[PDB]
Symmetry: C3
Subunit: 155 residues, 3 copies
């Protein structure tokens, strides 16, 4: 009634946390380092499993800060009571492929990351780190009626 079952699949997974008694969602962390070049799609593994009860739906959705600063687009996933296992972040680096090159990757804050080893990246590329806040989980009550076909509507 007042508890949610959470399972960690690997050592690299972090426990989802509710920062404040007013923060409606739960912070979801990445369990792998992914380099996403322009227009690239990926399903980023969190290595976290949830057992949501019946009559409820989970919303694995993007953070307001990351989505506004970066070209990283997270398609909101619907977490049912039936689907157990590794939760994937449905993501796409929506930055355009302009065929231009740069020597800097960008973090989830759109800031240039200065690495010691010099490499050539395609412009607009992003990098996501381990245990990094990229998405959040939102559980909302869901209404299930048994639908019947009608020729016309009434009240």
């Amino acid at each position: 009634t007042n508890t949610l079952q959470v399972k960690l699949l690997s050592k690299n997974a972090r426990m989802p946390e509710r920062n404040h008694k007013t923060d409606a969602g739960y912070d979801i962390f990445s369990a792998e380092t992914v380099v996403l070049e322009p227009q690239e799609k990926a399903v980023i593994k969190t290595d976290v499993a949830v057992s949501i009860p019946e009559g409820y739906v989970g919303l694995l959705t993007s953070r307001s800060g990351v989505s506004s600063k970066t070209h990283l687009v997270i398609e909101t996933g619907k977490i049912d009571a039936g689907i157990h296992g590794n939760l994937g972040i449905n993501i796409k680096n929506d930055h355009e492929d302009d065929k231009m090159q740069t020597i800097f990757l960008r973090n989830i804050d759109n800031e240039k990351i200065f690495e010691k080893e010099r490499h050539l990246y395609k412009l607009g590329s992003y990098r996501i780190e381990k245990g990094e806040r990229i998405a959040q989980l939102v559980i909302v009550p869901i209404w299930t009626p048994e639908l019947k076909q009608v020729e016309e509507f009434e009240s």
Copy 2:
């Protein structure tokens, strides 16, 4: 209380179905064949009508499989109690227009469809078939308070 009114506008419409007693959503099928080239927007007709009651909101949203595999982006529609009639899938083929050509279209599983008649398509194009699972419907309770203007907030 435990029933939803569903209307089929044409012979090409399919009845929305809840596969399992745990599947929180209802599978929504396409009622037309649409070829979407890169960057193209469309409102795909389902020929299905719903009569959602007051205090509830419908969410016509993308499937996890289709949205992760293909460049097809479905903007989640909000189905009110007032709007009756043909439900449209707000979609966009988000694949970039690179001016390149191919002889293969791609299905909702991103697989190459091998057609007998040879044709030239623009690279990144998709095709959606009749009675094909592209989206799903999610009904959630909605809270309506009568808002009042205040100069400062209190409790």
Copy 3:
């Protein structure tokens, strides 16, 4: 119980309104004129503040008409009980940058706006006006359980 606290930060802000007793959402208006060229991201200020209670989450999401007609993509924001202040519309002009030019901007209805003063714009650019319906607010009950780590799931 049946009231929502709404605050207007400036003279350019408009009060969110529920048109009909069946319209599940509240119309959100822009408080500034923004010209968005292809691929450009912005946080459009509404100058409106809300005090959503605990156990509820706000959904600042796009309108069905605007999102289907224009290349303007609004990333749905989650409005918590803790975050008070100016609500920002997380937007991106998803139109491709084809390096082509036109002398017409486009409104939220994708129509060409004919201005007296002749100017050169980049093709696919949009303009948003003051007190213009671009987004809507949807408040949904949110379930908060205290999560506990388990090795395996049970019932």
